[PDB]
Each structure stands twice: as C-alpha cells, then as structure tokens.
Amino acid sequence: MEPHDTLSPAQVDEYRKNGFLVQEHVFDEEEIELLRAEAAQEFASGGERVTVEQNTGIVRGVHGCHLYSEVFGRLVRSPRLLPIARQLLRDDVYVHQFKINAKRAFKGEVWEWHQDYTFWHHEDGMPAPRALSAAIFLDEVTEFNGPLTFVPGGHGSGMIDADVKGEGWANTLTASLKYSLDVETMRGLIERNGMVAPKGPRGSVLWFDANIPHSSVPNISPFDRGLVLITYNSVENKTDVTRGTRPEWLAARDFTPLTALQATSF
Ligand SMILES: O=C(O)[C@@H]1C[C@@H](O)CN1
Helix, strand or coil: CCCCCCCCHHHHHHHHHHCEEEECCCCCHHHHHHHHHHHHHHHHHCHHHEEECCCCCCEEEEECHHHCCHHHHHHCCCCCCHHHHHHHHCCCEEEEEEEEEEECCCCCCCEEEECHHHHHHHHHCCCCCCEEEEEEECCCECCCECCCEECCCHHHHCCCCCEECCCCCHHHCCCCCCEECCHHHHHHHHHHHCCECCCECCCCEEEEECCCCEEECCECCCCCEEEEEEEEEECCCCCCHHHCCCCCCCCCCCCCCCCCCCCCCC
16 A cells, blocks of 8 residues: 555645645546446445435435445545544544435535534534545536535534424435524625535545535536545544434444555455
8 A cells, every 4th residue: 555645734724724625636537436336336235225316216325335335344444535534533533424425417406504513413422523524526526516515614613503304314314404504694604704616536535524514506517426425533532322313324333443454465
C-alpha cells in the first residue's frame, strides 16, 4: 500500500472552517468501476436494505453494505480513507452508517435541508457530533446532476432545532425527511454563510461534517450521480445502544476500532 494518506494543514483548516472538503481523484477509473459493479449487486440483492424513489420506484438507496459485501468491508478500511477519518475525528473510528445514493440521469428528488447528526442523535443515541461522512463520487459531480449542497460553516451552530414529522424511522431515508430545517432558519443561515455545491471528477471524495446542513436537487443531466457514503464515528463517541431504535444496517453496534488494509498477495 501507499504510505497512509493524510490531509495537509490547509486542507484540515478548510474542512474545519467550511465543514466539507473535496479531494479530487482519490480512486481511479478501474477502482470506481469495481465499486459501481458492487453497488449494482447490492441494489439487486439488498432486499429490505434498499429504498426506491416514490412516484418512480427506481432504486434510490441501499444501506449497510459493508456488513454484507467483502469489497465494501475492505473499502471502509482503505488507506485512502481510514487514516483521514482518524485524523479529522482525532480518534480510532468505526463505521456508524454506510449507504449508496444514486440519482440517475433526468431523475432525482429535492432533498430537504437537514443535518445528519440530528438523525443519529435522536434515532441512534449518538452523544456528540464527533462523526463525518466520506462521499465517494462514482460519477463526476457537476452543477446539473443534483450535487450535495451545503451551508459553508453551517455546522458551527451545532445541532439546529428541526421540524419533526412521522413515527418510527421509515421517513429517515425518504424524500420527505423526518428532521428538516424550516424556511426561516435556512434563510438566516444562508444570508450569513451562503451556499456551495462542491464539484469533482469521478473518484473524488467529499468529506463532510455530521452537523453541516445539506440539501440537493434533481439530476437534469443525461448522466447519473452515484455516491458511496461512509459515515465514520469516533470510538469514544460510540452510540448509546440503549437509546437505539434502528437496525444494525442503519446504525452499527460493533464499535471495534478499524485498522487499515495491509497489502497481501491476494
Ligand atoms: O437517517 C439517517 O441516518 C440518514 C442521515 C441523513 O443523511 C438522512 N438519512
């Protein structure tokens, strides 16, 4: 393997200030094709772990793949990913959540403004927002294929009071989100901080804070927007399983600290 990757001090500062950071071209075309093929397999065989877009039935997401797929199990331990998660969370880490979110060409939904941590705190018993997500770009992310859109520095407020809607956890994965940020709060945020939709080539990784507000629009391009999202959590920040409400394929219960893939002959 290559000497474990880490972010420069400038990159770390940028991540801390803005709440997100893109590394371009982390994975090459052949690597991304391997991940795309495995994603397709998970969409086909994932069963109850799969979600479909309402009004289309097109497969939208699949969850918990690193528990069921050897490829994705290895991916979360990649020397391209694990060392940076450790660096940013300043701890050993484990995977809280794994999901693949596809927005096909000419498809896609408006994803309501939200903070991930609100879900993890209330649904899963995550005590603090000492977690982040790595979004691997299976496709080039552009202005026009429904990029994750953020309020830069919007995580600095911490967790924001949100409109709650629905019972259970069914609507934690849907177009209509259980925890959504209202018109008023978002106006103030954006007036103060603005909006940014990070772009990048296929194989890029977008790191973003558990508490950063984000949203996305439909894909009006003729090109898909597949993302593999790995949520790393600090081991010290392990969720309180006694307040947990969701299956392990949404919220992990094995808090064993991850170690990196080492090079083998097979
Ligand atoms: O419910 C969850 O855990 C994730 C967090 C947000 O991305 C929305 N769905």
